[model samples]
Target chain A: SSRDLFRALNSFIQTPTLPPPADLDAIISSYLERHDKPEEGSGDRLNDELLAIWDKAVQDHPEKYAAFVAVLRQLRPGLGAPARTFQWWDKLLDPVLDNATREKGLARSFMDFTLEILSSSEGFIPWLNRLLVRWMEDLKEQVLTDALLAFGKKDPKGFMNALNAFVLRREHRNSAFSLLCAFVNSGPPHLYLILQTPLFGNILQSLQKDESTFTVNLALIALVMLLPFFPGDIVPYLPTLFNIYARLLFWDRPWDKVLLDPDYDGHSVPYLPEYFTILYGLYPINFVDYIRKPHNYLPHAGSDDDIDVHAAEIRERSERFRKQHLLHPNFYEYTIETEKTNITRWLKSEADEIIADCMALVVD
Target chain B: SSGSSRDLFRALNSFIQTPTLPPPADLDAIISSYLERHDKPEEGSGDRLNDELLAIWDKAVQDHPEKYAAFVAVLRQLRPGLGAPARTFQWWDKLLDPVLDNATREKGLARSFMDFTLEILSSSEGFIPWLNRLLVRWMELRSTDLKEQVLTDALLAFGKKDPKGFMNALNAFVLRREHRNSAFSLLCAFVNSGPPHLYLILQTPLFGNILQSLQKDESTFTVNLALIALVMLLPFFPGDIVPYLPTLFNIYARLLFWDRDWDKVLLDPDYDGHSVPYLPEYFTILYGLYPINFVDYIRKPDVHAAEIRERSERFRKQHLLHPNFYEYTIETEKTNITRWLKSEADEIIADCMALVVD
Candidate 1:
C-alpha cells in the first residue's frame, strides 16, 4: 500500500487537477526512500515532482509543513540534485526567514538546510557570498563558524572569493579577519588557497592602516601562519616586508626600557613578537643571496626547458624551503628579548648591503 | 562662327589624335584649351565634380594614350618649362585635383607634375610661396586610393632635392595650430622615408621650433601633438637623448601642473575626432628612458629651500583673504600636488622594483 502511494505520488502532482491527498508527507517520504539512490541524468522527474509538491504545500497549511520538511530533508547534501536543490534552496531561504516569526520551525529547518546545501554544492557559494558580510555580522557564532569551515573544506577557492568580497567593505574587515582566522585555526584542509587568493595581498597592504590593534593582530596572525608554507613565493614581497620590519623595530622599545621609564604609564598593550619571529625565520640568508644575485637562485636556468618543468621545479623548491627552516626556537628568543640583541640586526644587515650594491649598480 | 567652332574642335581633336608638332598659332589654341578652357559647374553648386578638362583628357587617354603621351611630350619640348602652364593652371583652384589625378595616373603627366613641383621650389624666390599650400591642399583631397603614394612621392622628391625648403614650409605649417596636426603627421610619414633627409629634418630648427611652440603656450591640442611628434621621433635621435634631460625634466615638471583640458579636446568634434590623455603620454616618455634618473634629477639641492619659501609666502598671503577661504584653497592645492607627485612616484618605484634582475 505504501509502495502504491509512492508510485501514485508522481502523477498526483504531475496532474494536479485532483484534490490534495491525505498523508502526502508519508507519500513524499516513501518516494524519497524509494529513490534515495538517485540515478544520474534520471532524477529530473523526481526533482520536478518534489518541487511540484512544494508549490502545492505553499498554498496549504499543517500537512504543507511536513511536505516542506520532507522535500528539504531529501535535498540534503549528497542525496539531492545540485541544480534543482540550489534552485529551490536559494529561492526558499529568504522567504522562510521573512516568515520566521510566524513559523519558527520552518525557518530553522531552512537555515539548517542551507548549511547542508552548502556542504555539497559549489554553485550556491556565489549566492551565499552576497550575504556573507551580513551573516558574518549577525549570525550566531557557531552557525557562522560552521558555514565558514564548510566553505573552506568544500571549496577553498570559493571561500577566498567570499573572504575578498567581505574584506572589501570597510566596516566588515574585522569580521572578515576573524572569519579567516577561524578557517586557518580549524585545521585548514587546503592551505594553498590562502597563497593563491588576493586576500593575502589585501591583508598585507592594509596591515599598517588598521584602525585598531585587534584587527592588525589578526592580520599578523594570518600572515605568520600562512607565510611559512610558501617562502619562495614571497620573493617579490621581501623588499616590502624588510622595509616594514625595519620600521616596526624602530617604533618598538625593549620591555625593560618601557618598564623603567620615568613617566611609566601602566598600559598592558602587547606587541606582536610573533610577527618578527615569523618573518625573521623566513629564509633570510636565501633571500639575501637571491636579492644580490637573483639569477643564480632561480631553478629554471635553461630557457629551452618546458614551462611545466619550470613550474614543477619551483613548487618542489618551495616545499623544500618550507620544510627546511621554520620558526626556530632561537628566533623566538631573539624577538622576545631584543633588549640586547634585536632581530633587525639580522634582517636588515644583508638587505642594506644588497640595496647598496643595487645603488652602485644604478649609479655606474 | 559655326565654321570657326568646327575648326576649333577639329584642331583640338587633330592635335590630340596625331601627336604631331603644331605651328605656334595652332599650339596657342591647344595649350589654352588644355590648361584653362575646362567647363565650370553651375554658379556655386560645389567644387568636387570635375570640369570638361577631365572629359577631354579621359577621351584622349582611353582612345590613344600613347598619342596623348606624344601630345604631352610635344608640349614639354615646346614649353620647356612648367611656369607658363603652371600660371594658367593655378588661376583656378578647381583644376588642381583633376590635374593631380592626371599627374599620378599617367607617367608623362606625373613627370610634368613632379617637374613643375620641383621648379616652383627651386625657383621659389620668384614663384608664390605656394608649394607648401599646394601640398597641404592636395593632401586633403577626397580621392585617397592613390593619395598615399601621391603625397609620399611628391614630398620625397621635394625633401630629397631641397631638405631646407621642405622643412621651412613645414615649420610654417606647424606654427599655426590649425595646420599643426597635418604638418606633424606629414613629418611622421617622412621619419621612415630613409636616412639623409631623415637626419636633415631632425637637425633642422624644426626640432627647436616644436619645443619653442610648446614652451610658448599650454594649449592641450598643441601639446598633445607635440608629444606625438617627440614620442615618434625619440627612437630616431642621432646621438644620445642625454643632452635633453634637463630640458625634458623642466618640461614634464611644468606639465604636471598644467591644466588637464584633454577632455575638452576630446569632446570637441570640430577640434579633430581624436585626442590622447596627457599623463599617459607623460609617463610613456619617462618609461622609455631612465625613469629613476629623472627622479634623482628633479631632486635639486635647493628643492626643500624652494618649498619652504613657497609656503612662507603662501602663509603670509593667507591673511589677505577670508582665513578659512584661503586655507581651503591652500589645502586643496596641497592635496592635488601631493596626489600627483606620490601617485606617479610610487608607480615608478613599483615598476622598477618589479623588473626582472636579468
Candidate 2:
C-alpha cells in the first residue's frame, strides 16, 4: 500500500500541475517515518528513485515541481536531520533549475525557477538560506558564470566585468582599494551579493599575499568596509585587520607635534584616513599620519583666526577651550556614522544593479 | 423619410454609445433598429414578430450583418474625427453573444462584423483620441481574448503623430484612484514606447497631483506603473529628469516602506499586471533615479527583455502603421545617460514562472 504511496508521491513531484498528491498524507507519513527512523529503517521508503522522471522536464510543468518541493519541505520539519530529508536538495534542485535553462528566454526562466521554489517552500526559508551560503561557497562561480553566459546577457558582461579584474585580480593598489571600499560598504544589497562572488574572495585573498606595510594599510580600510554588511561574519578577520590598523597607526608613523601644526582644517575630511573617522564608528579620530611626505596630514581645520587669544573677552575659565576652538574642530573631525551616511548616499546613486540587489537582500 | 421614419430614427439614438453615426456601420444599424422598435411598441409589434427590433440587434450583428446599411446611414451622420468611445461599445457588450461573438480576424470569423467596426474605428479621426479616454474608463476590464487587442488599439491609436495623447491620457489616468487600476498596462506601453516626450509631462500640475495621490488602489497593478513613467524615462529627458529626484526619492522611499523585506522585495515589485506584459518597477527604475533606497530589485537574471515584447510585436506592427500609433514596437538603443542609468542605477525586473503576473 505504501509502495503505492511512494509511486504516487514521485508522480506528484514530477507533474506539479496535477492535484495535490492522491495519497498525500500516506506519502508524507512514510517520508517522515523513513526520515526519523533510519537506524531501524524497515517498511516501504519514499525512494529517491525519481531522478529520471523528474528530469524529463522539457516543459517541466512548474506547478508540479513546486508541489513536490512543497511536500518535501513540509515533511522536512517532522523528520530528524538525515541525508534523506535533504537528499533531494542537490539533485532535485538541479532538475528544477536546469529545466529553466533548457527553455527559451533562459535566464529569466532560470531565475524564475529558483525564486518560485524559494517562495513556495514555506518551511525552508532558513534551510535554503543556510544551504545557499554553503552551496555558494562550495560551487564554482565559474560554472554559474559559464552557464549564465550561455543563457545570454553576453553584451553587458563586458560592461560588468570591465573593472571586475581589479576586484578579481587585485593588482593595482590605488584603484583596487578604493573600488573595494566602494563595493564592500556599497550597501547590503550589493555588499551581500558581491561578497558571494569569487571576486570578493580574491579581494580578501589578495590582501594575504603581502605583509608589506603598504598592502596592510590598504587592507585595513578594505576590511573596515565590510563592517556594516557583515558584522558577525567578518568577526574572524577583525584581529588581523586591527593588527594592520595598529601597524599603520603606530609603527608606520611616529607621532610628531609638528605633523598637526599645519593649517589642517576646512577641507581636511577627504584626506583623512577612512577607518579612523569614516569607518570605525565612534572610535577616536587619528588626525596624524607621517607615513611618507614628512609633514602633510589630511587638511585640518584652520585655527579660528579672528578670535583674539590674549583678549580679556575670553570668557572661558580655561584658556585651552578658547585655544582649541581657535584650532581644529577637535582634531577628530567627523563621526564614522556621518561619513558612512554620505558615502552610502553617493555610492548608492552610482551603484548599479550588481550592487543594488545585494544591498537589498541583506538590508531587508 | 416620413414622420414615422424620423420617429423611428430618433428612437434609435439610445443604442448609439457615441455620435449619431457610432461604430460607423451595421454596429450602428441594428442598434438604431433595436432602439426604435423598443421606444414605441407599435400595434401588435412589441413582442417578437411585428417589430423584430430586438431580433434586428442579434440579426444585424455577425450573424446577419448584411442588414447593417441602416446602421451605416446612422454612422454617416457623426463627424469624421469624433470617434465612438468604448462606452458605446458597451452597448454591444450584451449583443456580441447573440449578435456575433466571433473573435475572428479575417480568416477565423464565422462572421467578421467587428472587422467593419474596426475598419471604421481605424479610419475615423476622433476615434483614436476617444479610444484613449475609453481605455482608461474601461481599465478594470478582465475579459480575455478579442477584447484585449481590440481594446489595446486605443492606446496604439493615440495618434502616432502625437504620442503625447497617450501620455496625456495616462498622465491623467494615474491621477485618479478610480483610474489607477489599469494604469499598469498604460505605463508599460508608455515606458516601452521610448518615452522621448515624457520630460514635459513630468512638469505638469497633472503630473504632480498624480504622483501625490499615489493610491494603493484595490489593484497593486496601478501603483506598479505609477513611477515607471518617471523612472524609465529619466535618462532620455536630460534637464527635466534629475531635478525631480526628491519626488522620485520620496516615491521609492515609500516602496522601501512597502516591502521592506530586502530579499523578497526585489522579486516582489509591487502592484503587478500582465496584459501588456506589464510589470512596473517603481522600486527598480527609481534605484537609479534615486539610489538612496538600496532596493533589492535587479532584472531577474532571466528576463533580459520583456517577454511581452514579441507578444506585442504583431500588435505593434499593426499599430506602427498608423500615425496614431507612434508608441508601440518602439525602442530606443540611444541609451547613454539613461540606459546606463537604467542598467547600473536601476536593475530590478522579473517573473514567477508567470506567478507574479497571474
Q: What share of the reference contacts survives in each candidate?
A: 0.00, 0.00
Candidate 1 per-residue lDDT, tens place, A1-364, comes to 3346445554544433223456555565555565644646336655665566666645455334534654555534323455666577556645554455565465456556766665542433665574475366423434445655765677777787778767766677767877777777676565656667788877776564543445555666777666644544676676566444433333333000101223532222133454544553554333322322333434454666563453344333333222222212221122222312333433433433433322322211
- Which candidate leads the pack in lDDT? 1
Best by TM-score: 1
Report the C-alpha lDDT of model 1 over B7-108, residue by residue, as the tens digit. 445665566766543335555655444334333322311121122224455677445534544444433332322234353234223334544555545555
Question: lDDT of model 1 at residue A197?
Answer: 73
lDDT of 2 by residue, B113-185 (tens): 3443444444533334454544644575533465455445434544333455655656556555555545645
Q: Compute DockQ for each candidate against the true complex.
A: 0.00, 0.00
Residues A1-364 of candidate 2 have per-residue lDDT tens digits of 4355556666666554433645676766655554555334321133333444446632266555555555555454443334444455554545554444443333343344334433443323233333223323302332333333222222222312333444443244435555445434423243444444454445445444443344444555665455445433443354344333333333322110111213422212221144433223212111111111112222333474332321112222122211111111111123323322333333433325323422321210
Model 1: residues with Cα > 4 Å off, grouped in runs: A1-49, A52-56, A59-67, A75-81, A95-124, A130-133, A136-141, A208-214, A249-271, A284-364, B1-358
- Clash totals for all candidate models: 0, 40
